[PDB]
Symmetry: C6
Subunit: 216 residues, 6 copies
């Protein structure tokens, strides 16, 4: 990565941490924040390093490759290369593959990131990667939000844990997720807690809901 802006090689414990995360957590939602944290200020070479280090899950890594290629293609369509030689004191405009790090040197990436009025190639590539990771997380989620229902003997807190876990994996905008929270959560609770929740009303917070069904 580059830290203020000075280039640093990716540390062994950062890379190991990411590898271990992929092994232990598969493609759980929390891996995406983790990834970002382990790739803070990272060059495209660092990001490719993290992805390539993963052994196994090669179907998911291939899907990630196809997503990255789609994003690179869209970038190329939006940003067409301009003919003519590069002038001194200037650098060539980055193609999609340069952002992915496959066709650009480390010095070129450093140059784009450090130069005044910069192009943050690492952050763009990072966005593409996180997009594909979201695709993978959503496909690999077994459960659907509609199916989560509270058991008759199940404590409300556990039910809310399951519900919001599944919700975190769901493919939906924040408006849709809001609708799910304010529609399905109370509807799918068990009858005792469901009645008690209905009694609270439409504006009840999560804290009030969990406190109300705490005894239940």
């Amino acid at each position: 990565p580059i830290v203020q802006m000075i280039h640093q090689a990716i540390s062994p414990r950062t890379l190991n941490a990411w590898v271990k995360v992929v092994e232990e957590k598969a493609f759980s939602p929390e891996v995406i924040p983790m990834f970002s944290a382990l790739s803070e200020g990272a060059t495209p070479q660092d990001l490719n390093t993290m992805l390539n280090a993963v052994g196994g899950h090669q179907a998911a890594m291939q899907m990630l490759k196809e997503t990255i290629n789609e994003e690179a293609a869209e970038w190329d369509r939006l940003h067409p290369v301009h003919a003519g030689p590069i002038a001194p004191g200037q650098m060539r405009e980055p193609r999609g593959s340069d952002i992915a790090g496959t066709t650009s040197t480390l010095q070129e990436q450093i140059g784009w990131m450090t130069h005044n009025a910069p192009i943050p190639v690492g952050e763009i590539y990072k966005r593409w990667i996180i997009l594909g990771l979201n695709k993978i997380v959503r496909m690999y989620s077994p459960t659907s939000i509609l199916d989560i229902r509270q058991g008759p003997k199940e404590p409300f807190r556990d039910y809310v844990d399951r519900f919001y876990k599944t919700l975190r994996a769901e493919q939906a905008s924040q408006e849709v997720k809001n609708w799910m929270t304010e529609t399905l959560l109370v509807q799918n609770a068990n009858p005792d807690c469901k009645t008690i929740l209905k009694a609270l009303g439409p504006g009840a917070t999560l804290e009030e809901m969990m406190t109300a069904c705490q005894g239940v």
Copy 2:
């Protein structure tokens, strides 16, 4: 984080330490100091990194989200955005969502924190987070302070351990906690140690109390 003031990426072992703390300790009181220590000088992006890295406890993390949104809303009510373009050499006033890091870039956060006469967005957001964490710790505490009572064969020291643990989780100001210490502790001790404690008087320190019932 930012260390003197120079921005640093959150270290892998800091993040791992926080994750492990959440796994092992759930929502015990000591997690809140720990959090602070692991977030010293942290940007809103770092704080969101720590929260988002948590897998599981999604009910608590959702409660935390609602608390953060309430605090952001109160901030927005107190600090209304002013119309007009931002001048050169100046930065826009931060909204509630910018303090939470959801709507502000890393460079904007760094700019607010580093600039002369700064706005410490990381510390404000950190306060909101710790507020919600206090809500969660208090709700997730099974015991109540009134119920802690010394067993007849129970050594006084163990009883004081239980008492002050439960007290640490309790929802009360320092005046109320003072009243609890000076009222309930001696009252709920077992009869031998309770008599001996009554003999000491109202001004007896904790050290004197534990020394007096040490043989008992």
Copy 3:
């Protein structure tokens, strides 16, 4: 902490090291040096961080709180606040609670420590903490120095280990501890080694004593 003088956030492995030390070693004497070593150059915020991170032993942590409050009160009596506004280029005199870090900001602590003709708030608070830790170590020691006696089949070296361990926990000045070393150690040895030790005389060193009873 602050290292030369430049402020640094408390490292995750320092804090973890202290937590582990409290868990494994309880309140053995060696925890107090350890504490100091883990708090070298630490601000009051760092010290509070270390204390607050401890889970359990809440009776001892409460005793520590009462000791810190007594020391803060004595400081306040010795150093009375002076009326009048603080001038530019100067900082307010620290109250007891400011030294304990409960009522002072991190920037205020840094300012006191870094400024020319400084007030070392971290070292003062550290002294208070170590004082309370000594109270706790002494109360939590089960054994008394008078009771340590050499077994008939017990090797002298083991007996000296037990003796000086208990002595290290004892509540006594160096003059009293000297008297204990030169009175009780030889007196409480077993008859064979006790006779041999008496034969050496009053000025015999520990090395000579252990060498003399090595065969015994």
Copy 4:
């Protein structure tokens, strides 16, 4: 290594990380990215350090030696040494063995890398090493891409994992690997999923294929 450009000794945890990787992962594809990441900015002395540290797999390490010697020989043929004494302010042109680090000092390597209009000896040597590593990975792969076939009860995702693992080990250009992906993957699937995949058509993405046979 050298980090910006300042020379650094190879860290103990980098070297240990590489050694552990060779032990645990043998010669799986992911070891080659790992190697690169652990050798970022490394001098030829660092690279030789990493290779020489490996215990066991001496057949593979010998193959690696022969590949490095072939690459050094080709370099020497392309770059013939020029007679005449080296001038002040200039350094001798590197031979193949100098790039491999066997015949060049650390100061010479540092000089080539740091000097203006530099020769990156570490990156050239690194390319040779990675070339030989590719030879070893390909020879040590037991499976062939043609043999990977989906089981009748085998979930499609597992089959795609096996397929792309074997493909990653395969000795083929990206055009050939493209042909394999678009020819053999759908052909070697089981009849239910194979029929469903045929129904999608030639332009179907991996995500669409896995989603389509997800129920299957």
Copy 5:
């Protein structure tokens, strides 16, 4: 410690390393080099930190205290304090107890070490400590060099291992240790290897001796 010269707090892993070394290795010879390595450039406060951190072996730590006091007393006899006030730009001459760190501040130690024409208080104290450690290692060694004898079925290499281990613990100058090597080693070997060793002669090296009795 102080590293070039800039003061650094003792790291948590250095201290932990020393503690673990004392636990696992007791007072084996190799602990003394280890100690030195963990105390490189250390102030008297750091050295006291390392000694005080040790739990257990309190007889040995007390012996160490008596040795340090003897060395401090000899220093005081050689270096008598001179009456008169300390001038500006100058520092007081260190007493024995100041070198031991018991009566000197950290700033005083730093001042002695950093100042031009310095007094290396840390290295002097370190010498005293290592002297007492040698006393302890020698007393705690069970074996004597005269007793080490080769078994009839014992391989020569194992016998040389035992011999030089015991020799390393022995209390003797290098001239005496030379005499022991050139007298007792060949004399105490078993008859087959002893005869073969006698045949080599008085000037035979250790390598020649081990090679000669390798088959034996």
Copy 6:
């Protein structure tokens, strides 16, 4: 060590790494590269630190001492000390024992290494140590290269592993090792693979040999 050139104390994890390497790997060939890597830029004090830290293998450490003394003696014969006082701005020429670090201070070593037109005492001493380590590795190798022979059911790759391991331990120049590779390897293979190898010819590479007997 010294890193660019600035002196650094040997890290705890470097030393621990070396100790663990000696414990686990004994005197396998790979320990010698490891040693070098852990001693990069190290002073003679650091090298002595690493050697002295080893517990056990005292026969080998003694052999190492005799080798170092022989190398120091040869250095002294080649470099005779010159009579006359050392001038200001100059340092005394190093004797053999100074290079070994037994008779030279840390400041003297630093001075030799840092000064313009330097004497690299650490690298010279390091060469002596590695020489003695080679003696030890060769003596402690049980197997001889002539004895390695392929089993009838033994896969060729395993046989090449054993062969080149033993070869790595062998006492021979690169010309002799070349002769062994091109004479004994094919000769000692089993008859099926030996016939197939003979069919390839004298110029066959290792890769071709292993590929040819892969089915065999």
